[PDB]
Design a binder for this molecule. Structure first.
Ligand SMILES: CC[N+](C)(C)CCCS(=O)(=O)[O-]
Length: 357
């Protein structure tokens, strides 16, 4: 893999850009999130990054941390979910940048958003208040709260759906990774009820599931805050601030993920990808659409890209990408849907565009 840096820019607010996401759900357009805004850009030839339009929150004290794309099931158009410090989810029409609707949990910071891989209405949020929440954005219902008796004991920083959206792995400041299965009879039934719920046709409130018990948990992977997690098939990729992505699985080497029980005491390490100078927290890796490649920025503007197309996780091939003018911490990266462009965004509000050759 070989990429050439073709352009860069800086947003006027001079605050960190915490998040970036290409739109894969219909569109080449990407969103950046930082300060109290979200900004859309469109990629063109000769490295042009064309500024479109922003959403700016009415609260000058809001700080957006993340965003996530989906489809509107009512209008067929792409939609953008944004959230951050105020713990309010904004659903933004990316055409007009109008805020169409919002969701409030208990109102504590939201660290991550993810949409279900098969159902564009099912939005997962992870919070500074120790809980995950699953929302149905067609019927505007809180489907479930994941938290409580054996949930996270400190801020949740990240989470990810598996390929099918049957299960979620979450991770946090408590150093733990926790599995929550959503293909239980209980959860499939609760999703089905969320779709049957119309507040205009009934007297009841929608009753949320309180899921107090994860289906697997470990603290044996990292020795500090776990700030980013991803499924790679049935394996997990996760990181802390100890300059490593660990590739691992619940149970022993030969255990199937779907036969893992909540009492499982074992994990298996399949590999570890080391790098340098990335010991501040909330530094997120990303993969391309096909999960052939894995990209992470460090705190001094260096990019690491791993080629995952090898027989075993430990055989991954690393390429590094540097620019003499790119020296601020890279918080997140995103690949275009066709894998031809890589964007990195930075603590100094700078955006970096890398085109594949
Ligand atoms: C703004 C994102 N949160 C979750 C607060 C992480 C801040 C980590 S920091 O202080 O290195 O920017």
């Amino acid at each position: 893999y070989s990429f050439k840096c073709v352009n860069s820019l800086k947003e006027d607010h001079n605050q960190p850009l915490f998040g970036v996401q290409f739109n894969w759900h219909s569109k080449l357009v990407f969103a950046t999130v930082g300060s109290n805004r979200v900004t859309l850009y469109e990629c063109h030839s000769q490295g042009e990054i064309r500024l479109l339009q922003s959403y700016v929150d009415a609260d000058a004290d809001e700080n957006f941390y993340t965003c996530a794309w989906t489809y509107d099931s009512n209008t067929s158009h792409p939609l953008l979910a944004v959230a951050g410090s105020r713990g309010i989810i904004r659903i933004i029409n990316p055409i007009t940048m109008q805020c169409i609707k919002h969701y409030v949990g208990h109102g504590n910071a939201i660290n991550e958003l993810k949409f279900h891989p098969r159902d564009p209405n099912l939005l997962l949020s992870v919070s500074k208040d120790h809980a995950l929440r699953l929302w149905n954005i067609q019927t505007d219902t809180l489907v479930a709260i994941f938290g409580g008796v054996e949930g996270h004991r400190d801020e949740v920083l990240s989470a990810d759906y598996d390929l099918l959206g049957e299960k979620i792995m979450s991770c946090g400041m408590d150093h733990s990774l926790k599995l929550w299965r959503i293909n239980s009879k209980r959860m499939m039934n609760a999703i089905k009820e969320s779709y049957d719920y119309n507040p205009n046709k009934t007297n009841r409130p929608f009753i949320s599931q309180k899921i107090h018990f994860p289906d697997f948990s470990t603290r044996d992977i990292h020795r500090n805050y776990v700030d980013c997690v991803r499924w790679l098939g049935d394996l997990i990729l996760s990181k802390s601030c100890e300059n490593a992505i660990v590739c691992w699985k619940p149970g022993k080497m030969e255990d199937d993920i779907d036969k893992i029980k909540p009492s499982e005491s074992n994990v298996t390490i399949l590999g570890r990808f080391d790098y340098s100078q990335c010991d501040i927290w909330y530094m997120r890796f990303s993969t391309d659409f096909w999960q052939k490649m894995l990209a992470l920025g460090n705190q001094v503007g260096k990019l690491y890209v791993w080629d995952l197309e090898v027989e075993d996780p430990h055989k991954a091939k690393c390429t590094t990408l540097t620019h003499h003018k790119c020296g601020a911490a890279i918080r997140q990266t995103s690949f275009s849907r066709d894998s031809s462009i890589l964007i990195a965004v930075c603590d100094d509000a700078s955006i970096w565009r890398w085109d594949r050759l």
